[PDB]
Each structure stands twice: as C-alpha cells, then as structure tokens.
Scaffold this motif. Structure first.
Motif, mmCIF file in Angstrom:
data_model
loop_
_atom_site.group_PDB
_atom_site.id
_atom_site.type_symbol
_atom_site.label_atom_id
_atom_site.label_comp_id
_atom_site.label_asym_id
_atom_site.label_seq_id
_atom_site.Cartn_x
_atom_site.Cartn_y
_atom_site.Cartn_z
ATOM 1 N N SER A 149 1.277 -2.203 12.027
ATOM 2 C CA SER A 149 1.400 -2.874 10.728
ATOM 3 C C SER A 149 0.319 -2.388 9.756
ATOM 4 O O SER A 149 -0.531 -1.572 10.118
ATOM 5 C CB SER A 149 1.307 -4.395 10.908
ATOM 6 O OG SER A 149 0.018 -4.788 11.350
ATOM 7 N N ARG A 150 0.365 -2.893 8.523
ATOM 8 C CA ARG A 150 -0.652 -2.581 7.513
ATOM 9 C C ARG A 150 -2.015 -3.160 7.888
ATOM 10 O O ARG A 150 -3.031 -2.477 7.772
ATOM 11 C CB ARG A 150 -0.235 -3.105 6.136
ATOM 12 C CG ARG A 150 0.990 -2.418 5.559
ATOM 13 C CD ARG A 150 1.407 -3.054 4.243
ATOM 14 N NE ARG A 150 2.720 -2.586 3.798
ATOM 15 C CZ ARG A 150 3.363 -3.024 2.714
ATOM 16 N NH1 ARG A 150 2.830 -3.958 1.925
ATOM 17 N NH2 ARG A 150 4.558 -2.522 2.411
ATOM 18 N N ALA A 151 -2.022 -4.413 8.344
ATOM 19 C CA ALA A 151 -3.254 -5.113 8.731
ATOM 20 C C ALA A 151 -4.032 -4.420 9.856
ATOM 21 O O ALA A 151 -5.262 -4.349 9.811
ATOM 22 C CB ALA A 151 -2.936 -6.549 9.129
ATOM 23 N N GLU A 152 -3.308 -3.914 10.854
ATOM 24 C CA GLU A 152 -3.919 -3.248 12.012
ATOM 25 C C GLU A 152 -4.481 -1.860 11.684
ATOM 26 O O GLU A 152 -5.540 -1.484 12.191
ATOM 27 C CB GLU A 152 -2.912 -3.147 13.164
ATOM 28 C CG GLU A 152 -2.486 -4.498 13.723
ATOM 29 C CD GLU A 152 -1.462 -4.384 14.838
ATOM 30 O OE1 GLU A 152 -0.445 -3.682 14.651
ATOM 31 O OE2 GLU A 152 -1.665 -5.010 15.899
ATOM 32 N N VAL A 153 -3.771 -1.109 10.843
ATOM 33 C CA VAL A 153 -4.179 0.250 10.459
ATOM 34 C C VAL A 153 -5.334 0.237 9.443
ATOM 35 O O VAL A 153 -6.212 1.099 9.503
ATOM 36 C CB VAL A 153 -2.980 1.065 9.904
ATOM 37 C CG1 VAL A 153 -3.416 2.446 9.417
ATOM 38 C CG2 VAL A 153 -1.891 1.212 10.962
#
Lengths: 559, 559, 559
Positions: free
Chosen positions: A53-57
């Motif tokens: 996801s965006r949050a993890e990357v």
C-alpha cells in the motif's frame, strides 16, 4: 475585484504526476533535501506491481531495501545509489521481489528532475518490463476612463444618427482609443476559475477568441467608402461595461451614479427615436403641433428645440408625470407612447426600486442604529430607569455602536473555518502575543488555540468591571489606556500599558475571591479569557505550561 | 409539479382489513413466506373473543397450539394445517378454549388470499358462532400550448366583439383544440390528497363532474343558429389557467412573462370597452374630439386609429401617467375613468409590487452577496487587515459563495427528519462509503450514523488546514484533488485521491499531537469527522469495530 | 442627545504621569490616605534603574527598605520619612543598591502634590544621577426656536429675491437673533470624542474656529451700502440645522414633521426659480399663456396668482401628477421641467420611501402584534383549540403583549456586559433585595450574582402556576398582588405582599414533591429562580449562606 492566488512553488509536481499518469506509467517520487532521500508519492501502478500500500511504502529511502531478494544482484545495488549521487537517465538492469515473493523482468528508469534554480531537487523512477497586469494602478483608473468615452460615444452618436442629415476631429480621437483598447487586452492577464492566474502570449490569445472579442472586433470598424446607419456599430461599444460589471460595485455612491446616469441615456435614445418618427412621416402630427406652440410654420423650426422637446416628452412619459404639452396623435406616435409607458412602468419600478434601496443600503449603519435606539427608549419607559443608570445605558450603547459601527463580531467568524478564525484573532491580538514576555518561547499551535478564546473587551471612563467579593473567573491583560484599582474609596494602585491582573491558577486550584475594585480613566483597551478556557489549552502543552507560569509575572494577586 | 407516490405492493392488506371491518367480522391474518407461517395482524374482535392481547398472540404459528383444549378434537387438528397445504374456503368444525378457559361454539372460516401473481401469499381466518399520464413530456409542453391559444382567444374575441359590427378559418381551428382538450382530460390521471395516484376510466369520470368541467363545458359551445355577444363564453376559456396555476411557477423568468403579458390583456379589454362607450351614445364626446385631432368629420374615421387611441388612453390612465390627448367629458366617459383610476391605483401597487420583488427574487443570490461583502469590507476597515490576510479573506469568501451559491448547508436539513437527513448525506458522501475498503462489510445502520457526522470541507490552493504541534481532533479523507505534506519548508509527502491521514484511536486512547503541516495545490475536495464523533458510533457496533480498524490503512500516523 | 461622562476625581493622575513621561523622567507615586503610604504606580524608567518589576515593587512603603545597602547612610534614612511628615521640594542626597547589588550616584527629588482641597493627598519621587451648558432646559427648546426662524428666513428671502424688484421691521429682528446665536455658541459647552466635556473660555474658542464658524460667520453679514442678490447669504443659515442633526430625531412624529415641511421648501424655491425664468426672457412663453387663462394682456397680471401658479406647477411636476394647465414650451422652460422631473423622480422615491417606512416605524409595536396574532389564529385553526383553552391563549398573549409592548426581555441584555446586566436586573428587582430581611447583611457581589438568575414572571387572574405532585424546581417571591393556595377545591391559605413559598434546600438535599396548587386573584407580580441556580451561587459565599437560611423564613414548606 477578483484576483486568484498565485500557484505555489511545488505545483509542478501535480503536472508531472498528471504527465506520467497520461503515459500509463508505473513510478515513485523521492525528495533530495530530506535526510536519507525517502519516498514522497507513488501512483496506483506501483501498488499493483509489488502489492504494498501507500502507507507501507512511504517514508522509506529510495534505495528500497525491501525490493531486494535472492535474484537481485549485489553489483548493481550500488547502481541504485550512485544515480542519486551522479544524476542521469539510465535503465538499471535488475529483477526484484514482490510482497509475497516473485521474480519479474523489471527495469528502473532512473531520472533526476531539475527546475529553474539549477539543482538536484527531486528524483523519479519510472518502471517497465514587456509584461502587463490586470489589478495595477494603470489598469484600475483606465477602466473608468474607458467607461467615460463609452458614454461619450453612446450618447453623441445618436445625436449624429438622427439630427445631422471641433466635433469632427475630437470624435476620431475616441475611435483610436478603442483600437488601443484591443491591443491592450492581449497582453493583460485574466483569471480562469481553475487557473487562478495565467500569463505570457502563448496562452492568452486563445481565450480572447471565443469570449468577448467577436463583439468588440465590430466596434473598431470605421470605414470611409452617405448613410450614417453604418455608425450603429459604435453603440456596441457599450458591451465593454457589461463584461466588466464586477469592477463597478466598489464604492457606495459610485453604483448610484451609474444607475442615475444610465437613466438619462435611456431617455436620450427614446428622444432621438421620437424625433425620427416626426421626420420620416410627411404626407397634423406632433411637429406641426409644436410649430404652433412656437410660431414657425412651413422654412423650418429650431434644432435646439426639437431635441429638448423630444427629451422633455420621453422624460415626462417614462417618469410617469404625463403633462401633455407634447403628446401623440397619429398611429405611429401613440404606438411609441404605448412602448414608453410599458417600459416606463417597468423601469420606474425596477431602477428606482434599487435606488430607493441603495440610499438605505448606503446609510445602513445609521438605519439599524435608530431601531436599536427605539428598543432602548422603549426599554427605559417600560421599566422606568433612573438618571445614574440612564447615563450608563446611553453612553455605553453610543460608545459600543460608534466604535464597532453596529457590527456583530462573532457573526462574521462563523462562516470561516477554525484555522483562519484563529488567524483573524491573531491579527487583532498581535499587541499581546508578540510583545509580551511569556508567549515568545512558544510554538504556533499554542498561539492559535489561545487566540480563539481571547475577548477584546472595551472599557470607557469610570466603568467598574469587577468588585470586591466577586469570583475572578477571567484573567485580564491591559494593552492601552490607564486603569485604576480601589477599595473603600481609596486609590490602591494604577496600571498603564502591557500589564496583568487576576490570580495564579496553580496555588489555589479553586475559584478564588476578589480583593478590590477596578475602574478605567481613559477609553482603555484590554483583553479577557477564563479560568476554564485557559487550563483546557495549557494542559495540552505540558512542556510549555512550565515556561508559562514561571516567566509570567502578574502585577496583582487579588485575594 | 405535485405528483403523489405510488401505492406499495402490500397496500391491498389495508383494504382487506377495512373490508372485513365493515362486516363486523372477527379474524386474524398469517403470512405464507415466513418460516412456520405466523400471525401478522388481528382485529379487536379476535382480542375480545379469546381475551389475549395483540402482543401475546403475534409471532405465533396459525395452527395456534394455545387454542387447543379438552373439548378440541384430535382428528380435525390436521384440518387446520392441510388447508395451509391445500387452499380452500372451508368452515373447520370445532370448539376452542379462551385465556381463562371456556367452551364456545365457534367455526373457523379458513381462506387463502391470492393476488395477480397466482400464488399462495396470505392466509385469513374469519370466525363465527390505451393509457395516459399527467407528468409526461407530451402533457408538459401541451399546457404551455393550451395557454397560448387561451391568450389567442382571450384577446382576439374582444377585437371581434367590439369592432366587427385567413381569420375566418384559423379561429375555427382553435375552437376544435378546446373540444380535443375535453376528451384528453378524461383519460389523463389526477392526484387526490389521500389517493396519491388514480387510473383507468371507471374512477376518473366521477371526479371530473363536480370539479371544473361544468365551467369548461360552456367553453366548447360554438352554435351557428347576428348578435356576437354569444361569443362571450370564449372568455371563460381563461379559467383553464386558473385551475392549473401550480404548473406556471417553475422558472424565474416565466412568472415575470405571465404577469407582464396579462397586464396588456387588462388594458386590451378596457380599450375595447372604452371604444364601446363611444359607439353606443349618439344623440361633443371623445370620438368627435378625436375627429378634430385627425381631420375626419361626419363619412367616418380609421379603424386602426380607434383601437390604438383607446389602448393608448387606457394605458395612460391605468399606468398613472395621465397625458390628456384623449380624456373623458360626458357622464359615462368619466365613470369609466373613475373605474380605471381606481383599479389602476390598485393594480399598479399590486402587480408591480410583485414584479419589483420578482427581479430581486430572481437575482436573490447576488443581492445577499453584496450585503455579506459590505460586512467584510466594514470588518476590514474596522480592524485594518493587512495584505497577506486580505487575500485569504476575499479569496475564501469568493470561493465559498461561488461554490455554494451563498446557501446554508445545515439550515435546509433541520426541517427534514433524521432518516432522510442521513439519506441526503449518504448521497453527498457516496464517493467514500461505496468505493473504500473498510466500509464494505457493514450494515445499513452503520452507514447512516456515520454519514450524519461527516463534514464536506473544501480547501482552495495553499490553504494550511492543520499545523505542527496542533491536536488532531479530526480524521480526514481525501476524495479528489492533490494534497501535500510539509515540515520546516521541505516536501515530506504528496497524496492524490481516496487517501487517509490522521491518527489511529486504539494505540494512544488520548488526544495525540500533530507531526507536520498539510496544504492543498488544486481546488481539492475532502471530508472530516472528530475523535469523539467516531468513537460514540463505533462503540455501538462492537463486531463491526474490529473489522473497521484492521482493514482501514492510514497513510500517515502523525505524532 | 450625546453628552459625555464627566472626568473622575483621580483623572489628574493620568496627566501627571503623562507630564513626567514627557520629561523622560524616572519616578514612583505613593498615596497618603493608605496605612503605611505604599506605592501606587511606577514608570518603566524606575524598573530599568533598579531591575525589579511592577509587581515586586508595588504594595510597599515609599521609605523603601529594599533600596538600603552598605553605602546608604543612616542619618538621612530619616530624611526620607520626615518629608512625608513635613512636605517640600528637597533633593535627598544618598546612594542606593539595585536588585543584584550596585552603587550609583542617584538623587531623590521628593515632592508632595496638592489639589484644590488643600491637603496632602499624593507623594511623588523623581530621580536623577458666568457659565453655560449644552443640555439645559434653556438650550433644549432654543434649538427648536432657532430652527423656526431658520425656516422663516429660508422661505421669506426667496419671496424677497424673486418678487420684490410690518415686514420691514420684523425681518430685522431675525437678523439680530443670528448675531445673538454666535455669541451664545462661544460660552456653551461641547463634546469631543475623547474629551467627554470641556469648559471655560480658554479652550472653547479654539474648537469653534476650523469647525462650523466660517460658514456661520457669513450668515451674520447684513451690509447696507439695489441688487438683492446680496441677501443670498441668508440661505446659508440653513446649515445650522445640518450640523445639529442628532437633536431632531427624538420624537416619532417630529421626524415626520421635518421631512414633510422641508418638502414644501423644495417646491417653494423651485416655484420662485420658475417665476424668475418668466421675468428674465422678454423678446409666446408660459406667462403670456397664463395671461390668456386669466384675461390680463399687456398693464400686468396679479402677484398672488404668479406665486401660486408657479408653486402649483412645481408641485404638479415634482409630485409626478402632471396636469398641464401650466407647462413648459420654450427651451429654458423645458430644461427646468427636465430638472424637476429628474429630481422629482429621485425625491418621490427617496423622501416618501422614508415617510412610508416612518408610519410603520411609528406604529411598529402594533405592526408585529398582528403578525404574532396571525400565528396564533393559524395555530388555533391548525390544531382546533376548544373554548376553555381558547380564552387562556388569547388573554395571556394580550396581557403579555400589552404589558411588555411586544419587546424581548433578554435580547436587549445580550449586548451589554455582565456587570451592567446585573445592574439592570438590580434596578428591576430592587423591591425584594433592599426591603426583605435576609439580603441586608450581604456584600455587593452576592446581590449581582443573584440578580442575574432572577426571572420576573407575571400571573394574571386564575392562572395555575404549579400543581400537586409536581417538582418544586423554583423558589418564588411575591412582591405585589394577592395569591391563593388550594388543594381539592378548598381554600388552604392566602398570601399578600413580600411573601415566600417553595421548599428549604438543606433538609432534603433532593428534588422534593409539591403539596398543593397555587392561583392568582389580581394581576399579581412575582419573582422566580431555581434550585440549581441558587445553590451554585450560595456555595461561593459560605459565610453568607449560614446567615441566609437562618434569617429567611418561608411561609409554606410544601411536601
């Protein structure tokens, strides 16, 4: 006048994401200035490629240690970093591993983006498998200047149209001004709803076509080649005011001057058209009827009379006075008077309905003043208020209205959000926050939260704010003026500017009693909060609250 | 246009209860679709028979095991059930026992009700001891078409009435249209206050009599059999607009066009009546006075003049201009001018009192715009607001008004109940609820309760919403646009669409501090709630709340 | 009429601080009346000299024991005190020590300030190293008297200006009154925005120049030295009303009388100017046209006609009636009628737009009465209210409106601050607080806090306030009238004036039930509070609360 806000310095990032979105690309973006050069945005194509996801990357170095695996070589791991150190378009030739783990023949198109400053600002990694303004002092007064020469042409060309079948040279000067008006409209800026400002000649010329040039292009056509009906195109110069309507609503008296002067032009054309009916019917009518009022039969009558008598008629008709010195008789004459009575009844309700409102809208403060005054005078007679209090009601109300213009303080703030509400109160209460000692070592969030709960109370001469025995709920600050302190009619102390009085909230931890009275001398300015309002903010900032009470020195602890 | 809502598919149950209520019957009703075929309604007659209440009898199989007793036989207990399995009118021959216990000679009239579908839907047990619409695109524009030919007849028949003592054929075409109008009114639907819609020709013809047919029946009577006063019935065709008054209040400019055009017809009749006074008094008057204005003594004068001069007079009289080219002298002439001045003073106040309001009511948005603008311009001069904030006040206010049309958001919702208020906010916030991941596995009650507490906040370019050090009370959702994140003037991150930022509420269980700033680039669209608003809803749905926090992935945990 | 509040007796302290601030002085101030003669104010110069703040230095004897040190001698320590005992300008010759400790060659300029009373009021220590008012019964009615003779001159001098090319002596009396008006304006007081009042002839003459004397100085110039255009300066006497505009808005009918009478003067000048056009064009016009209406050709016509006919014209023109007995023909005649129609259309909307509002503003109470009545009559027909309640709605509403004049009670108080709000309620509720027993032994803070939460409820005949079984939330006080007490339709007790009923709050410490009913006989007056409202105030004053419950004797403990 509406003028859109200029685009911030990072708005080119939106267009680059929008550009590579158009290619159906798969990519990420990372900043140079930040510590280890972490990721700042990733499109949905990159989320589908790996699975994360965006949050993890996000908030991870663009070397990307999670992208390594068994099949990712050790030699070109450096060939990720030295591009951040070297800067060039180079397809880094290696595989990677997804979230769950899988081999795929990918290829890192490493890019360094560079702006006008000439520096390494942002990284991007694609994957594959003479100037003029419109709110200047030059342009501002020139719209009023355009409006004058429009009114010149709009009036004096009907005079030429009807009656003409120093002036010859001066009318040609006005024709050149409109030709100058067209050239100036090209280089001047404009405001799109989305595009707040737009400049330079590649983009402005496209908007000018298919807008309001096709009408204004007809205005600048004075061909030489009889027949004065060719000059009817000069009436379309009036459209230049209709397009720029928002400019002419600034002043109160200026809107009245336009609606009053245009009322004359409505009559002026009808006067010239009324005259045209007299000329173009010769077989008894109104002109020979005028020829008996002033003894001139046929020879001919006077030109100056013919224009006045017509204007007099069309005023008398449209104003709804209706004299009958001059009045219709023949078929076409009455048809005109039916048209003037019909538009006159419409105009006299429409245009003077607004002008009747505009005078009360200009004197809008003094209108509500008398209504509020009648509430007080009714309230005095209803309750029977004696002289020592009679003065306090009048003088406070007259001081309150004259100072504030009878405007609601908090009613305006309700529409705005809490961010800009705090910024408004920060502007009003700048005299305390920036100048005083305890508020200097403080973050910006502490200033706004406090600024919300402040209340700028005004105190005229001899106003007893708080008395002995009362509960000191508030904690005041004195900005300007000169304030006394008394108890049992003896002068205890005086305070000038930038002073404080109330109680500390740490020692008691309770609602403490007051010590003595407090009264104003001059038209003093001061501020106010509450015990409950302060503590709810101060408890959110514990490291700030220790600095607050220590540095803050109150002139009177009142018990 | 009012059109009542169609009757639901179970409304036939109301009429069946209403039918058997008319018989003074004693009965119950049970559904077929539900598990064991339990009871769904019982009248008061059944409550009196046994003694039990509605609550106690309801939600029980219609075999009714409580109705058994000592005297109830075992053989015909099956003859309760196999009627639910067989379906027929059959009086089941057995006693029963009441609440307290008592024998009574009762008899179960078992019935299976069947609808148009041809299936066993509902059971009942009595005891004993070519089409046309009215809101179609055909009917819609045809009312405007009827209104035109009404105005044609209303004007041109006074012309025929007064003056007549291509046109002959075309006037007969309009007479046929009204005869076609009557036949169309039969097959078209109508709306009773109770009966929202009613159709098919057994029921519509009864309402048309004793309504507005008796007046419209006189309109369609063109008998052949001199004497043109027979055509006075064609003026009663004007009543067709009076009955359909709600249709002609849709557009803003359309209401103005009716009140302006009817003003001409008021003058038109008075013109024709004024002329009639001149003809029917011949023994000096106004017509011979006109015969000297235009040299035509008696021979005779012109017809085109006589109509214009009369119309000119009655306009000049009723508009309250009052020229006096033509004016009364004889008894009957003045009596008319008294009537026209009296109605004219009434009409000029009544009809143009509304038209003066209609122009300000048409431009109602821009009217309050300038009043709100004068509050701001007074507020600027009152406080002395500098340029960096001056722009923010104007651009936000101009963006807020231009977007919302100066309309109050929550002021409209207050009138509606909480069910439909949630449905309105569900429509506005459809882009988040249906599309996003965590809200999919959720019941309908969870969606409405959340939808209430959402707030659609709009953010123009460069608007700092929240800063570093502030308390993150809200938890935002980004629908559209492009939003940045910064701290100390360095670009930390960017967010596009369908993104989230704020804090999780499980880890801290406290009001947490902010990390950095957040600013908009485009005219971005986003949503907002609170920490207190969310938890109060989430705690009501504990099984949903576990699914919520797990599936919901926030892009920035901001500390 | 605005009249500023007189300066308090300690305002001379502001000017003395302002005086020694102008010298760049360094000083303190100490009072004589207080116990040990402590400090009351210190400027910033004194804070910089020693280092201590205002809070630390204040409330300390002006001997100042902290100013002593090693180098401060013992002999002249007395020469600090005996100046407080002796009083004289004497530079006390000694060093002192700062906060941190430091020697500096300072010198105490000891001063005793003395006012008009002739006593030792305040100490200061500098350091170095025939009358007339404007709101009197004489001046009040004399402004109306000035206004009359202004209207006399404004009208009768146009009569002299146009037509003249007992009265000779009386016009000279008015010329002397304006010369008397100038001399009176010198000795009379005025109100500056800052300086609330200012008196005696050294200060008033400076304001009168560069204000509105230069215009009024031209008014009093009747030189003797033909040519009556010299008397045009007497029209500028009209400016005396424009400056004193706030005086003529007191009564409702008085504002109507000014706008109605000035409407005549507008016509009066235009009448005189219309006549002037007839005289000064002699080569057919309007005057010879009048000479045929009334048979007088040339000899000459009548003077009384010429003034009336002109006034008749300019009324007919500006009122927008437009007869045409007299009307323009020549160029200059029509130009006038264009001017009168243009100003007439402006005036008829402006002046009668206000007068139309003034009649509804005069009858403003009875205007909203009928709107509130239509709400009730709609509410009756909407709900169908029967006769026993029908009477109660009408009689209460008619009693409520007729008593209060349809005025909002609390809506007026919201604008005022809590100090003066309490003072308003203290005036209304004076009948309880001053007269009753338990409120006598009480401080001023207790009176104001209670006064806020009181509610003056009125009870007409037969109004049941509270019933048996209800919760006695309130605790009432009977000021006037006569109130009964009943239970089961039997007369239990009667109460007259200055009586109490409810429950004590100490015994139960709970919401107790009621005993019986209570009804009014006369139009009784009473007051009301709450259980929660009382206790929140009483707990703040614990020493007062013991005195309260003991002395307060309730006539009915109702259980």
């Amino acid at each position: 006048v509406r003028r859109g806000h200029v685009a911030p310095q990072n708005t080119f990032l939106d267009t680059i994401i929008r550009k590579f979105e158009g290619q159906s690309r798969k990519f990420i973006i990372a900043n140079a200035r930040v510590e280890n050069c972490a990721v700042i945005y990733c499109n949905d194509g990159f989320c589908e490629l790996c699975g994360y996801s965006r949050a993890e990357v996000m908030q991870r170095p663009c070397t990307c240690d999670f992208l390594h695996g068994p099949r990712t070589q050790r030699r070109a791991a450096a060939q990720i970093a030295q591009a951040l150190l070297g800067a060039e378009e180079r397809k880094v030739e290696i595989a990677f591993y997804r979230k769950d783990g899988s081999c795929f023949l990918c290829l890192v198109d490493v890019v360094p983006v560079k702006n006008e400053d000439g520096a390494v600002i942002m990284f991007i990694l694609n994957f594959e498998v003479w100037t003029i303004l419109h709110y200047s002092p030059f342009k501002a007064v020139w719209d009023w200047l355009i409006l004058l020469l429009v009114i010149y042409t709009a009036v004096f060309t009907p005079y030429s149209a009807a009656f003409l079948l120093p002036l010859a040279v001066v009318d040609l000067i006005v024709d050149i001004m409109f030709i100058v008006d067209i050239l100036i409209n090209f280089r001047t800026t404009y405001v799109n709803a989305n595009e707040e400002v737009v400049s330079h000649p590649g983009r402005i010329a496209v908007h000018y076509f298919k807008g309001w040039f096709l009408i204004d292009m007809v205005a600048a056509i004075p061909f030489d080649l009889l027949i004065g009906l060719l000059k009817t195109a000069r009436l379309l110069r009036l459209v230049r005011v209709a397009r720029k309507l928002d400019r002419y609503s600034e002043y109160g008296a200026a809107v009245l001057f336009l609606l009053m002067c245009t009322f004359a032009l409505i009559a002026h054309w009808l006067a010239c058209i009324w005259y045209a009916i007299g000329n173009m019917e010769q077989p008894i009518g109104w002109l020979h009827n005028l020829g008996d009022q002033i003894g001139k039969p046929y020879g001919g009558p006077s030109i100056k009379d013919k224009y006045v008598t017509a204007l007099y008629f069309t005023f008398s008709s449209l104003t709804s006075v209706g004299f009958g010195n001059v009045a219709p008789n023949t078929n076409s004459e009455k048809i005109f008077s039916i048209c003037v009575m019909l538009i006159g009844s419409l105009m006299y309700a429409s245009i003077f309905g607004n002008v009747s409102a505009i005078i009360q809208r200009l004197y809008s403060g003094t209108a509500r003043y008398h209504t509020q005054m009648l509430r007080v005078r009714e309230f005095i007679r209803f309750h029977q208020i004696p002289n020592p209090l009679r003065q306090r009601l009048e003088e406070y109300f007259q001081h309150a209205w004259s100072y504030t213009n009878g405007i609601d303080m908090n009613a305006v703030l309700k529409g705005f959000p809490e961010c800009l509400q705090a910024d408004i109160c920060l502007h009003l209460n700048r005299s305390l926050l920036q100048h005083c000692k305890p508020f200097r070592g403080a973050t910006k969030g502490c200033l706004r939260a406090l600024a919300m709960k402040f209340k700028t109370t005004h105190a005229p001469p001899g106003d007893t704010l708080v008395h002995a025995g009362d509960l000191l709920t508030a904690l005041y600050f004195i900005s300007r003026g000169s304030i006394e302190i008394l108890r049992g009619d003896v002068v205890v102390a005086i305070l000038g500017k930038n002073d404080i009085f109330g109680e500390p909230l740490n020692l008691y931890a309770r609602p403490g009693k007051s010590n003595g009275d407090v009264r104003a001398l001059t038209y003093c300015d001061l501020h106010k909060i509450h015990r409950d309002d302060l503590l709810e903010v101060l408890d959110m900032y514990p490291e700030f609250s220790d600095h607050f009470w220590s540095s803050l020195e109150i002139t009177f602890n009142l018990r």
